[PDB]
Design a protein around this ligand. Structure first.
Ligand SMILES: *[C@@H]1O[C@H](CO)[C@@H](O)[C@H](O)[C@H]1NC(C)=O
Lengths: 54, 164
């Protein structure tokens, strides 16, 4: 038991291209998407493992 | 130094020179006075400026270690990445340190070369009208005023002056 809960949720991700489609089908255990993210602005970035404040 | 001028056959540097790394100190009946040999100082200033620019622009594509995250079962590829970035940073630190050291060496020896070359420039004009006092000075066997010294500075000393 982790956080007193034994069941485990495993999340997957993908990136839909423009003008394309995604198709889900299931009959159980479906943690369905309710929202998604449009990638509106690429660039140059990074992920910083730091502790400081802003 | 490597050429023997600084801290060598010339004892030490003059506190009284402020406008050049090298220069003259003439003493005649018209007084004493320091003068800066500007041209040689400009050669040296160009040398150092180009050296600094070289140091800045020669390592302007060094290496940028961007962070990559890995899971618990990618220890091998994570260690590959880790020691790769570590090795690149080590080799570039090595390069920076070697450049700094070798340039300090060459620059100190360049200044020594310039002092010795100026002493030689004066001697090669003054060939027999003067005598070396052994520490950077030249005793004039004739009487010569401030324009004599100026002709020595800008390099046009006229050898026909009777000297006994
Ligand atoms: C998505 O809709 C467009 C109509 O704008 C259609 O042309 C396209 O074929 C659809 N996607 C797929 C995968 O069929």
């Amino acid at each position: 038991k982790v956080n007193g809960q034994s069941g485990r949720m495993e999340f997957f991700w993908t990136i839909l291209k423009p003008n394309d489609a995604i198709n889900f089908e299931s009959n159980g255990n479906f943690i369905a998407p309710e929202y998604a993210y449009k990638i509106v602005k690429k660039g140059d970035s990074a992920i910083m493992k730091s502790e400081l404040e802003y | 130094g490597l050429f023997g001028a600084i801290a060598g056959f010339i004892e030490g540097g003059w506190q009284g020179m402020v406008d050049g790394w090298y220069g003259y100190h003439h003493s005649n009946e018209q007084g004493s006075g320091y003068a800066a040999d500007k041209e040689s100082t400009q050669k040296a200033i160009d040398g150092v400026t180009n050296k600094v620019n070289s140091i800045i622009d020669k390592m302007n594509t060094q290496f940028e270690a961007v962070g990559r995250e890995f899971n618990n079962l990618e220890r091998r590829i994570e260690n590959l990445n880790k020691k790769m970035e570590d090795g690149f940073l080590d080799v570039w630190t090595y390069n920076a340190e070697l450049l700094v050291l070798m340039e300090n060496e060459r620059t100190l020896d360049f200044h020594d070369s310039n002092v010795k070359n100026l002493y030689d420039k004066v001697r090669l004009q003054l060939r027999d009208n003067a005598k070396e006092l052994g520490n950077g000075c030249f005793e004039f066997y004739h009487k010569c005023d401030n324009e004599c010294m100026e002709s020595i500075r800008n390099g046009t000393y006229n050898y026909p002056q009777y000297s006994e």
